[PDB]
Design a protein around this ligand. Structure first.
Ligand SMILES: [Cl-]
Ligand SMILES: [Cl-]
Ligand SMILES: [Cl-]
Ligand SMILES: [Cl-]
Ligand SMILES: [Cl-]
Lengths: 239, 247
């Protein structure tokens, strides 16, 4: 579990211009003792670590989209700076096996194996360390060397985790910053009908996307056939 | 813990599938009123489904906030000797939207796909620096509305803005990075613990062949990135040329 981890840090954006270090703590007062507190008084955002992930998820759920001296607050979890993308996993790697494996590089905040809608592993996973240099060590040694998890010499591919945001997307209020957003909205959503000036090129875009799909599915099919032949010649493990 | 109100967000639709909680490993001696009493703290509850013989069920709270608070307080909590398994239920009518135009927003994506049914939530995926990734999520109220949007956009070109590039609509491939894979069954692979292969051994030699095709796909996936890139700029040049053409 551990207290005041990086998974407990919350991002509080759109703060008032005259926000102070102690007033920012008065917001999260009823969530225990505040941990590391930093605020960017210029841009108007700040970070704060809570005692546990549970307290952080409760404070995020209660304080997000709430007013403060006029401005609406944007509360979310800060982007984990020590997160690594783990892929090329065998379908027999668990969360504990993934955590026990990468624990030798440093303290593990969390380690999960991404699964599909049924529960089967997708061959990819996520590992989050307590410090960024700990994740850098795991990223370097796994890429410079060969790190195995099972008996099969299937190496693990470690990359920096591209953390996307599918919770709070891109609100329209933030989209009004660019003037061309309103210029694009001059035409409402529609279906391109034949005979239109834009119909000829809409079908060419859809044809280009179909060409991209056919080429990428051909590449991903050749790797699967190559990955299956490696496990076939492995049966001939004798030198 | 304890805190009160109904915690509605400005203009939030209530009793959506986002506030739908799956409660597993329930004791076999539980009723509908008993599970409502367990969630009585978290406000008004809508639908309540129960499978008494199997030990699971569904309950839909008012808002997403009340469901997240009920999850963190009731997950892995003992009840009649058994630990509760509280988890957000998977959205049955969720759609993935790719190839979004440059200027998009959550409200634009919601207003656009609202022509196929009642949209519960629409989100434009953004990266670390707030830039859109080109992918989006559209969640409908029911399955027929999601299939209607899927069919109309598969055979027709659905345009969101002025730019004449249609978006690609696919069924949402629900990936779980929360519960993960805690444990599984016996398909021997774990005779040897995780380790670094010694350079020169058969494990090191054979694993380097695995890294070879991994980076081989990276070059092929980047080669098709260039093939689509040059055909894209050719099409965009042909559009700006036709933009100047007006009789
Ligand atoms: Cl910044
Ligand atoms: Cl952040
Ligand atoms: Cl690597
Ligand atoms: Cl309901
Ligand atoms: Cl930031």
């Amino acid at each position: 579990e551990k207290t005041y981890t990086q998974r407990c840090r919350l991002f509080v954006g759109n703060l008032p211009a005259d926000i102070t270090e102690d007033e920012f703590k008065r917001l999260f007062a009823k969530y225990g003792e505040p941990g590391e507190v930093f605020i960017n008084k210029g841009k108007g955002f700040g970070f704060i670590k809570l005692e546990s992930r549970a307290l952080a998820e409760i404070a995020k759920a209660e304080l997000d989209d709430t007013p403060m001296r006029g401005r609406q607050l944007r509360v979310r979890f800060a982007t984990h700076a020590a997160a690594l993308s783990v892929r090329n996993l065998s379908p027999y790697v668990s969360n504990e096996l993934l955590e026990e494996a990468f624990s030798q590089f440093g303290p593990i905040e969390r380690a999960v194996v991404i699964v599909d809608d049924r529960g089967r592993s997708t061959g990819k996973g996520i590992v989050e360390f307590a410090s960024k240099p700990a994740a850098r060590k795991a990223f370097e040694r796994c890429s410079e060397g060969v790190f195995l998890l099972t008996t099969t010499p299937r190496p693990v591919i470690v990359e920096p985790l591209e953390q996307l945001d599918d919770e709070d997307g891109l609100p329209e209020k933030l989209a009004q910053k660019n003037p061309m957003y309103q210029k694009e909205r001059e035409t409402p959503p529609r279906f391109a009908q034949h005979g239109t000036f834009e119909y000829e090129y809409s079908q060419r875009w859809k044809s280009l996307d179909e060409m991209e799909k056919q080429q990428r599915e051909q590449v991903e099919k050749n790797m699967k056939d190559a990955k299956d032949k490696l496990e076939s010649e492995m049966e001939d493990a004798y030198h | 813990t304890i805190d009160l109100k109904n915690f509605r967000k400005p203009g939030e639709k209530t009793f959506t599938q986002r506030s739908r909680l799956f409660v597993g490993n329930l004791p076999p001696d539980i009723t509908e009123e008993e599970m409502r009493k367990l969630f009585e703290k978290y406000g008004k509850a809508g639908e309540v489904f129960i499978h008494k013989d199997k030990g699971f069920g569904f309950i839909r709270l008012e808002t997403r906030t009340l469901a997240e608070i009920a999850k963190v307080e009731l997950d892995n909590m003992p009840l009649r000797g058994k630990q509760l398994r509280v988890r957000f239920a998977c959205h049955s009518a969720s759609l993935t939207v790719r190839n979004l135009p440059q200027y998009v927003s959550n409200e634009l994506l919601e207003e656009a796909f609202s022509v196929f049914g009642q949209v519960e939530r629409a989100v434009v995926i953004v990266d670390d620096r707030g830039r859109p990734s080109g992918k989006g999520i559209v969640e409908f109220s029911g399955k027929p509305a999601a299939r209607k949007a899927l069919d109309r956009c598969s055979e027709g070109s659905f345009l969101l803005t002025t730019f004449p590039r249609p978006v690609t609509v696919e069924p949402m491939d629900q990936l779980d990075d929360e519960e993960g894979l805690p444990e599984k069954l016996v398909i021997k692979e774990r005779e040897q613990p995780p380790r670094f292969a010694q350079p020169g051994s058969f494990e090191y030699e054979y694993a380097m062949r695995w890294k070879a095709l991994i980076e081989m796909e990276k070059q092929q996936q980047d080669q098709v990135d260039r093939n689509i890139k040059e055909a894209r700029e050719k099409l965009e040049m042909e559009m700006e040329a036709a933009r100047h053409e007006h009789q």
